[PDB]
Amino acid sequence: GMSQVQSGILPEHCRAAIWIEANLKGDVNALREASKIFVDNVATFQAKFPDAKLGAVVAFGNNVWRQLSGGEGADELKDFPVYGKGLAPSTQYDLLIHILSARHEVNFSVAQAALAAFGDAIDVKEEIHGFRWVEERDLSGFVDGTENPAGEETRREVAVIKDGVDAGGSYVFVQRWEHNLKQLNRMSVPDQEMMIGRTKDANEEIDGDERPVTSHLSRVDLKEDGKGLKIVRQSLPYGTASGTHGLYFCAYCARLYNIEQQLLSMFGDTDGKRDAMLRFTKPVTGGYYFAPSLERIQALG
Numbered sequence: 001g002m003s004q005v006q007s008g009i010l011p012e013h014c015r016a017a018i019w020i021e022a023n024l025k026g027d028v029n030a031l032r033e034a035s036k037i038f039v040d041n042v043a044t045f046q047a048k049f050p051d052a053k054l055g056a057v058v059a060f061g062n063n064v065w066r067q068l069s070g071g072e073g074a075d076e077l078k079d080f081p082v083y084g085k086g087l088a089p090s091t092q093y094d095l096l097i098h099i100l101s102a103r104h105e106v107n108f109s110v111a112q113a114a115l116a117a118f119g120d121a122i123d124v125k126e127e128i129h130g131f132r133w134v135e136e137r138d139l140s141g142f143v144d145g146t147e148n149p150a151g152e153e154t155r156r157e158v159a160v161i162k163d164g165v166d167a168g169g170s171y172v173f174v175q176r177w178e179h180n181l182k183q184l185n186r187m188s189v190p191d192q193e194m195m196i197g198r199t200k201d202a203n204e205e206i207d208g209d210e211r212p213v214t215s216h217l218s219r220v221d222l223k224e225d226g227k228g229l230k231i232v233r234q235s236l237p238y239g240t241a242s243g244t245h246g247l248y249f250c251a252y253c254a255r256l257y258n259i260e261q262q263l264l265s266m267f268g269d270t271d272g273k274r275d276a277m278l279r280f281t282k283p284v285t286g287g288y289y290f291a292p293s294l295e296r297i298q299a300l301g
């Protein structure tokens with residue numbers, strides 16, 4: 001009589017992922033059997049490819065989750081709002097599928113399985129292939145992940161709802177960024193470091209009172225009476241060298257509150273200042289989703 005977390009929230013250092021964002025085209029009922037088929041497929045792929053260390057998550061937007069849940073629980077869930085009066089655009093969809101593992105080829109098979117399960121019930125809006133880059137750096141050349149919650153125990157504490165109807169579930173935030181690396185390369189390395197809040201090559205934290213309040217770390221390293229507002233990030237670089245490229249931002253949290261506070265901070269709603277990264281990169285999508293526990297995906301019918 002307990003709850004199991006979906007397999008894709010907690011894994012650390014996976015080298016590849018696929019994110020599919022889609023709208024519900026018909027009766028929301030179609031999502032019931034599809035979701036059950038999908039998590040069964042994941043179990044099948046985990047059995048066939050034990051060395052892939054595969055995990056996946058199926059999550060739902062506010063409108064369809066209120067229908068599937070009958071309005072019970074997920075009290076913080078809402079459509080992703082526009083932040084900074086539009087600085088952060090809003091592209092709220094109905095369904096999010098997140099696949100991650102040590103093997104892109106296995107991820108690809110799982111994505112095909114997801115598409116076959118949901119079939120013509122969904123309208124795919126975005127499919128992004130994330131890849132870990134050299135030294136786990138973002139395409140900007142700064143290491144991404146250093147202060148991310150480490151270890152299953154702490155990641156569970158931060159990402160997984162502990163009790164009540166939603167025990168084992170999590171809130172998910174996805175936001176695709178498009179980097180302008182030409183604009184970045186116009187900046188001196190010291191200017192870039194003051195924009196992030198860490199040194200570039202050695203990845204050393206710059207002290208809070210040495211770095212601008214607009215620095216990324218100053219915007220998102222938030223505390224409430226000394227307790228950090230932590231989140232579990234699963235973000236990865238994506239794109240082509242000659243085309244669109246950037247960071248696919250993805251975070252999980254037991255409370256949507258921690259994510260929203262960081263967004264209000266970055267986009268100027270809190271103190272009128274905004275994240276210095278907007279000098280070379282911008283968000284073009286945005287959505288909030290609820291990732292139920294595995295057994296509730298099994299109580300979908």
Ligand code: HEM
Binds near residue numbers: 143196277
């Ligand atoms: C272009 C988009 C982004 C880039 C390139 C980026 C990059 C980075 C880098 C380089 C770090 C420092 C190393 C680390 O501790 O991980 C960092 C930290 C962090 N980022 Fe971001 N980030 C982006 C967007 C976001 C967004 C949208 C959020 C939250 C809403 C976020 C939340 C955080 C948090 C919580 C940390 C850890 C801060 C700390 O406690 O030290 N980031 N990011």
Ligand SMILES: [Mg+2]
Binds near residue numbers: 147221
């Ligand atoms: Mg800190």
